[PDB]
Amino acid sequence: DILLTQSPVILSVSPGERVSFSCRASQSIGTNIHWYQQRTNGSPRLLIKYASESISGIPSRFSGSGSGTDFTLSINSVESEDIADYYCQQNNNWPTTFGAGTKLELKRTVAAPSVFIFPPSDEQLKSGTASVVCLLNNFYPREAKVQWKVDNALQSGNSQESVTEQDSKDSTYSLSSTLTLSKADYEKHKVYACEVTHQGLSSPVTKSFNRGA
Amino acid sequence: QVQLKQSGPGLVQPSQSLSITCTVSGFSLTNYGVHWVRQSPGKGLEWLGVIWSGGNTDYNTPFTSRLSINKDNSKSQVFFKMNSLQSNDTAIYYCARALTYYDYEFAYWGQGTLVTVSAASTKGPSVFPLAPSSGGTAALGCLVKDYFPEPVTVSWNSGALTSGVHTFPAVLQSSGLYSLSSVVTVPSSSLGTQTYICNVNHKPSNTKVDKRVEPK
Amino acid sequence: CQFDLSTRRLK
Ligand SMILES: *[C@@H]1O[C@H](CO)[C@@H](O)[C@H](O)[C@H]1NC(C)=O
């Protein structure tokens, strides 16, 4: 099998800049290489066929070049909707094989998160479990700290985070922090606060509620 | 135009078989061959096989022993069956079509079928509201909890509400069940006049829930 | 980088 090595594994550029993807074959394959794009939750999208040939419906800012073993996919003016992974595929030798892909991340101005806190619903409490969700919305960059405190006790190990992939429109991330208690432990306390630290905040933002009022 | 639609995602027990149906339109299975590609965490994109216009099949070498592709030209359906699955066969399976009848540049793809190889049980999710309570912008959402396996789809107001929606990637809890939240930001003034429903559908369990999210 | 079945993106 032809081994296709794509480098680097991560690319990070700014809008309007030009970017290049490399895909190298373990032996000569002529120009028998194809390029695909995969957005979040998407299927592959054919961008270039046979090193350089255009595909219908693909924006003109996508192009390709190369021959032999060294091939390059290029975007001459990156837009926010170009956040995806990009793969190469060879079909000069059976069976056809794909590369491992390159991730395209986009830089942008710092944006502070908007923070919201949600108590557990009375519907969930009927099942003996309490979920306290802390939402960090539309921020950049991805680095963020969430600190849970129940009656000034530091929570640790009883929460889970989830970060969306980069938004195709404004390049921001959103983060959910879910603190999980038993209904017994949730009813034995009063003050629930998530403290958020981010580069775009001059000092940590704390959202809190008292169970009831 | 040209479309490929695959059967729903589901669980498969270890050492048991997998069956996916690819129904095509916009072209005839007598004029084009249909390929099958999978995408796993370990091996990435992996070409599996193809059934040609004339009915012949080629299988990639490590799968010639447990792969079987068939079709029905009249019903425009391609049938994929792989035997004796193990945990590392857990992947997204696609059906795809090339630009030309003989080639391998894949211009049209199916939406993908996430197959989970596991001995666990299929379990539908509970849906709990994330009720609103910053500068005239309110945040609300839904808690989709304790389901298995992935995936689960979440829309808002039957697709009419997409602006400001964030459905977070699912996380695996210590119980072995997944959980996620889907949130959206709306104007505070619309909380009185507009209804906000999250449409949750966990196809592996045939669990379909619509949750109305109100201020408490 | 590893492919993520939940997001269909590389992680
Ligand atoms: C699955 O494991 C087998 C060993 O039984 C290995 O040969 C194969 O490459 C693996 N496939 C993956 C990781 O997709």
Instruction: Report the nearest atom of ligand 1 relative to the CA of B43.
Output: 14
Closest CA to B215 of B127, B126, B129: B129
Q: What is the set of domains in chain B, with CATH numbers?
A: 1-118 (2.60.40.10), 122-215 (2.60.40.10)
Distance B88 CA to ligand 1 centre (A): 6
Domains and CATH numbers, chain A: 1-108 (2.60.40.10), 109-213 (2.60.40.10)
Inter-chain contact A162–B103, Cβ cutoff 8 Å?
A: no
Residue pair A44/A29 in contact by the 8 Å Cβ criterion: no
- Looking at ligand 1, which residue's alpha carbon is closest to its atom 11? B88
Gap between the terminal Cα atoms of chain C: 5
Q: Tell me how far apart the alpha carbons of residues A17 and A61 are, in angstroms, rounded to a whole number.
A: 11
Q: What is the DSSP letter of B123?
A: B
Atom of ligand 1 nearest to the CA of B89: 14
Q: Which atom of ligand 1 is nearest to the CA of B40?
A: 14
Six token digits for residue B106? 């894949």
Strand order in the sheet with A4-7: A4-7, A19-25, A70-75, A62-67
Q: Establish if C9 touches chain A: CB-CB under 8 angstroms.
A: yes
Nearest to B175 by CA among B114, B123, B115: B123
Residues A46, A34: contact at Cβ < 8 Å? yes
Name the residue among B109, B129, B134 with its Cβ closest to that of A121: B129
**Which ligand 1 atom sits closest to the C-alpha of B46?**
14
Which other chains touch chain A, taking contact as 3+ CB pairs less than 8 Å apart?
B, C
SS3 B157: helix
Of A91, A162, A165, the CB nearest to B180: A162
Sequence-distant (≥ 6) Cβ neighbours of residue A196 within 8 angstroms: A113, A115, A134, A136, A144, A145, A146, A147, A204, A205, A206, A207
Taking an 8 Å cut-off on Cβ atoms, the answer to whether C1 and A38 are in contact is no
For chains A and C, what is the number of CB pairs under 8 angstroms?
A: 24
Nearest chain B residue to C1, by CA: B41
Q: Is B175 exposed, middle or buried (0-12, 13-18, 19+ CB in 10 A)?
A: exposed
Cα A79 to Cα A63, A74, A106, B100, B130, distances in angstroms: 15, 13, 9, 31, 33
Cα distance from C4 to chain A (closest Cα, Å)?
Answer: 10
How was this structure determined? It was done by X-ray
Nearest residue of chain C to residue B38 (CA atoms): C5
- Cis peptide bond N-terminal to B62, omega within 30: no
Determine, for residues C3 and B44 on separate chains, whether the beta-carbon distance falls below 8 Å.
yes
Per the CB < 8 A criterion, the answer to whether B23 and B128 are in contact is no
Q: Give which of B25, B38, B122, B44 is closest to A86, Cα–Cα.
A: B44
Mutation target vs B (from C3, C5, C10; most B CBs, 10 A cutoff): C5
CB B58 within 8 A of CB B42: no
CA atoms of B66 and B61, how far apart (whole Å): 10
Q: In sequence order, what are the beta bridge partners of A73? A: A21, A64
Tokens read off for B194: 């507009």
Integer angstrom CA distances of residue A124 from A39, A121, B117, B198: 34, 5, 30, 16
Q: Which residues of A touch C1 (CB under 8 A)?
A: 9-10, 100-101, 103
Compute φ and ψ for A134, nearest 5 degrees: -120, 120
- Say how many CB pairs under 8 Å bridge B and C: 23
Beta strands A10-13 and A102-106 are parallel
